[PDB]
Design a protein around this ligand. Structure first.
Ligand SMILES: O=c1ccn([C@@H]2O[C@H](COP(=O)(O)OP(=O)(O)O)[C@@H](O)[C@H]2O)c(=O)[nH]1
Ligand SMILES: OC[C@H]1O[C@@H](O)[C@H](O)[C@@H](O)[C@H]1O
Ligand SMILES: [Mn+2]
Length: 275
């Protein structure tokens, strides 16, 4: 049950003026594509705060990747779901290498020692349903540079890969061998989604990761490994189970590789330079 929003004063949305004319802001299955200028964050923050939303963020830091955690977590503190309850889940082979990062109130961090493999690990299934409402699964070699907030939350979302958002579907680097579970033909495909940022309600994320893990097992059994590994399977899943929101490349950018085009008004979550 959802109580009433309080009175709020904000600019009237205007039916006969689009927010953004330069980009597609809704998919043909009527899922929002989240770009800056499409959302009023005050309205969304009220809606989510009224449900006492908790967001889990999962990140893997194995071997050398533990070096990326300090900047990742410190910048998540400045920019990710500020004002809402957050539970970071750090999966690592080195628990004593996780940096001590000061957290804001209502935010917690769990270290989970571990011995493509992210899909199996994420799919933890009992714990997540009891502790968070949504799960967001990202790469650790990244930093937040701007607001990443509740505008992303929805049953199931993927993020446009920054190298492919302008590309025709034949150019997408989908798995193209019919022998793989991840196979997608050249006349199919909506978008190319990056493996580095996806999420959803706990139930939807567990469904996805369970499906991708079972498809990867089948492929392994069969002597085949998809061209872009878990990302290839992520893309097959989201082709057949349409996400309820799609994040624009503001949410996964590499400024060194791609610059700062006019279509990106904010660069929110970005790659960190790495040898
Ligand atoms: O040795 C490794 C290799 C990969 N990863 C995790 O796997 C993610 C995806 O791999 P990576 O970022 O290396 O691939 P890329 O983004 O360069 O294609 C990394 O962010 C880490 O979260 C890790 O923790 N240790
Ligand atoms: O073509 C797909 C690939 O594109 C690269 O730019 C990216 O670094 C890879 O991780 C993979 O997503
Ligand atoms: Mn990465």
């Amino acid at each position: 049950f959802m109580v009433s929003l309080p009175r709020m004063v904000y600019p009237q949305p205007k039916v006969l003026t689009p927010c953004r004319k330069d980009v597609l802001v809704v998919t043909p299955w009527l899922a929002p594509i989240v770009w800056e200028g499409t959302f009023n964050i005050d309205i969304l923050n009220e809606q989510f705060r009224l449900q006492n939303t908790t967001i889990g963020l999962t990140v893997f830091a194995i071997k050398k990747y533990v070096a990326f955690l300090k900047l990742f977590l410190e910048t998540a503190e400045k920019h990710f779901m500020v004002g809402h309850r957050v539970h970071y889940y750090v999966f690592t082979d080195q628990p004593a290498a996780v940096p001590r990062v000061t957290l804001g109130t209502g935010r917690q961090l769990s270290v989970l020692e571990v011995g493509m493999r992210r899909m199996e690990m994420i799919s933890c299934e009992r714990r997540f349903l009891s502790e968070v409402d949504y799960l967001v699964c990202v790469d650790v070699d990244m930093e937040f540079r701007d607001h990443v907030g509740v505008e992303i939350l929805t049953p199931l979302f993927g993020t446009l890969h920054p190298s492919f958002y302008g590309s025709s579907r034949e150019a997408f680097t989908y798995e193209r061998r019919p022998q793989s579970q991840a196979y997608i033909p050249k006349d199919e495909g909506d978008f190319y989604y990056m493996g580095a940022f996806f999420g959803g309600s706990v139930q939807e994320v567990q469904r996805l990761t369970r499906a991708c893990h079972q498809a990867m097992m089948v492929d392994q059994a069969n002597g085949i490994e998809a061209v872009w590994h878990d990302e290839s399977h992520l893309n097959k899943y989201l082709l057949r189970h349409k996400p309820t929101k799609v994040l624009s490349p503001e949410y996964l950018w590499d400024q060194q590789l791609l610059g700062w085009p006019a279509v990106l008004r904010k660069l929110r979550f970005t790659a960190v330079p790495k040898n």
